[model samples]
Target chain A: HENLYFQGMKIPKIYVEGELNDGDRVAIEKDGNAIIFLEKDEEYSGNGKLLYQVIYDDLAKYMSLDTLKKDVLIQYPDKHTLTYLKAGTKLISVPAEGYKVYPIMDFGFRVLKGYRLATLESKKGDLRYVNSPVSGTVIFMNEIPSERANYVFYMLEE
Target chain B: FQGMKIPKIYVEGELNDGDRVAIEKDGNAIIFLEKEYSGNGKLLYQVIYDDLAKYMSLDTLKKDVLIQYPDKHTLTYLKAGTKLISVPAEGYKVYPIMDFGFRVLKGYRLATLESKKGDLRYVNSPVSGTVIFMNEIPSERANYVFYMLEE
Candidate 1:
């Protein structure tokens, strides 16, 4: 689909213009229409706008290891960043702000490409709104700066 | 190689030392001066002398004949017909005895002044430091950095 684009050697990337949390179920139509069945997030702020590190431990279940991965004909990430989001990919909406939260991972660990999926390295950004899968709780979403969210320079250590 | 910030320098004397600081578009530049040079006074050459001790000593320093006018700037312009005298960055030494150079055409050559990262960097005696040293001397410039303009 035109909405999905490739950055490195024939790889597809997903961008959700909405907000989600851990243990949330997400679906992407073949036409690249991506929807998240957002649940309560563990480390996530509960609202879609995350300013901290979204660890791999949060979304490990729903991504269903070998189960859900087998059903998909094509998938993005296949590696680190996508591997993490695949688990916690949930959607929640904040009705008060009139914005939808859709987060997308264009590149997980493929940082050599220069730009990030949707996160801005430095800039004033906009908002995304999402729908919580469980109670349908409204969650307003925004882009998060994952770079500075480190407890340490994990990559620099070794 | 990336040019770096001007190392911070502390000074005690009136004689000026220049670490050819880059002329940048952003970021405010820092320079130090005495009562002698300022207030509409043009800047002389901002040369980087790896050895500050040489400027003060006559025996260790060799006189360099500058082919130019002193009143124009302070250094000589390598005229069109002037043959570029070449020397190895290692074998040839520099002296400010005449203190002249290609004025203000800001350029830099990578350091033969090999101070590796983590080598003990200390300033001996009364010292002022800047992140960069420029064409500060008047006699022929060598070893440190040189300048040319345009494409």
Candidate 2:
């Protein structure tokens, strides 16, 4: 169940934590989990958090969720900072005092804190924590620099 | 610059030439490579740049030959089998064994490494513009999101 690759593409990936809506309509409900189907016309139905499962190639190229997690955190930035961190890798919590959350793994998407497993590449999958299916007007935000600092690049409109 | 409020969030660059680092004991490490070099400093005035940009020119910036001695540094002697070179794997490319950043923690399992469902995979924009921003925190769990996306 573990197979995902990118970098000169070959086709193999899967991860979608939550919060998808721009004409939403994703499917895979056969006990495999993942069922959205909301563009409108719904009493309300949701559940998303698969993060990645890419295995299909045509030339392999599709993006958004902020450019496919910034090309996998700048081309595997240390396989995502050495063990766990890639469900949406933007961290900032060390005295600035706030915004540092990474813990969600019942099957995969490691974030076991203290020591083993850490990964992120999320689009609010599982809605990060509910309340967001699309309804915005954010209009710009910044913090784009990396080597291990400066992240918080943002934008929203609709 | 607008509405200032920065306390900690740094990442200033360096490390290429078949970059690789895999140390993990509970705190950070595990890097392979694809492309990204030319160092300066940030997130702690870090430094690196041994011809990365060849000489993109900046008085040919120099200062870090990769730790001549950061005061006898010791993060436990980089234990667990340790390996720290950052850039030493060239071609004939063979150091073939240990020549990237360092190594000393095995079973390198990175969540299998790739794919997703909502379609969207065709990216080729080294830098153009149009993506304004999007950075989440406040416990939104996985929002390493830095504008338009995160991971």
Candidate 3:
């Protein structure tokens, strides 16, 4: 197995077991900063379960385990003991069999459903398409200003 | 020179530190005025409520401004020609309630029938918007509440 450097969390070992999932990321404290291996890649622009997103005040929030490698490096600079396996840093392989509780918006639980994506096309500026990411009638609720452009959204799906 | 009880004093230039001449009846001409006393002319200041969109939602204001200045004299809301205090009968409770928008409006001089929401049955506002009513600014649908939020 590989290791990721995230000091001070006292979570010495976190084993996430899921089909295709490299690992699961969870933060116990509500106000805790993005721990090691638990951050999303800032470069995750395409369609994927990203690391960082608008959590509140209209800011991006959330991220999967894979993105932690490319994104978390900026914050937790101690990478010697931290290494992500080339097995690929994607969550599509890991199953929710090993580690259960996941961290989202400070809450440790299952992935929330119905989160949408903010897209920007070549000409269409910043557009938000309200796609249902979960398995329910998740009515869209947001405060995207009027003049913004509409583009394709990258929702989370296995 | 003479009108109301206390004639409005008009200062041409910047007022002096300890300058207290005479403007009201009985020539309120007191002692050389307390060491730290002296009317420093009119440094006018007014707080006006702009568009709800242009603001950061008055909901945040009641806490940061109102609660901090609770005992201070502030502008209050009232019905057109009545003194009824509005309430949350049909979800029209104003000032402090962010959902329906604050329970009261602070920083106003008088509660005027500015505008209203859908059914102005009791709601009033000093501005208008696309809702039930946008006529006047009031805390409740009935009347007589403070003119501001937590502060």
TM-score of 3: 0.16
Please list the C-alpha lDDT of all candidates, in the order they appear.
0.23, 0.22, 0.22
All candidates: DockQ? 0.01, 0.01, 0.01
lDDT score for residue A43 of model 2: 37
Compose the digit string of candidate 1's lDDT tens values, residues B1-151. Answer: 2222332322222235542222111111112233333333223334432433233233221321112112211112111122222212221343221211211111222223323353332211121111112343344455333222111
Off by over 4 Å in 1: A1-62, A65-117, A120-158, B1-115, B118-151
Query: What CA RMSD would you report for each candidate?
Result: 25.8, 23.6, 23.3
Tens-digit lDDT string for candidate 3 (A48-158): 222222111111121244232222111111111111111223322111111111211111111224433222233334333332355211111122223122111222221
RMSD from true fold, candidate 2: 23.6
Give the Å error, residue B35, model 2: 35
Model 3 CAPRI quality:
incorrect
TM-score of chain A of each: 0.17, 0.18, 0.18
Per-residue lDDT tens digits of candidate 1, residues A1-158? 12221223323222222334332333432232122222235332233322122222112122343222221111122111122122223422212122222233111111111111222222335643322223211111122223222111010000
What digit string (tens of lDDT, one per residue) describes model 2 on residues B1-151?
Answer: 2321211111124432333222222222212223342322111122342322221232222221111111111011111122221111112111121011111122211111123443222222122111111222234432221111011
Best by lDDT: 1
